[PDB]
Amino acid sequence: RKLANNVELKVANMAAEMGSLVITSPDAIGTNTADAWNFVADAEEIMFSRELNR
């Protein structure tokens, strides 16, 4: 079980560290009405405009 968990941690950390597409917000997600949607949608918008393969 612990070895599986370590694999999970390594994958998550590599993703977070080598992530070029930084979506930034000045405030916490609970602040405005649809910050979570806006935040996912910023991710989608930058992936679309950069013309990445999805």
Calpha distance 37→50 (Å, rounded): 20
CA angle 19, 29, 5 (to 5 degrees): 50
* C-beta of 3 vs 52, nearer to other proteins: 3
Cα→Cα distances 23→2, 31, 39, 46, 50, Å = 32, 16, 7, 8, 13
Q: Of the ranges 2-10, 18-26, 27-35, 37-45, which one interacts with other proteins (CB under 8 A)?
A: 2-10
Q: Of the ranges 1-9, 12-20, 21-29, 34-42, which one interacts with other proteins (CB under 8 A)?
A: 1-9
Query: How many residues sit in the footprint of other proteins (CB under 8 A)?
Result: 4
Instruction: List residues binding other proteins (CB under 8 A).
Output: 1-3, 6
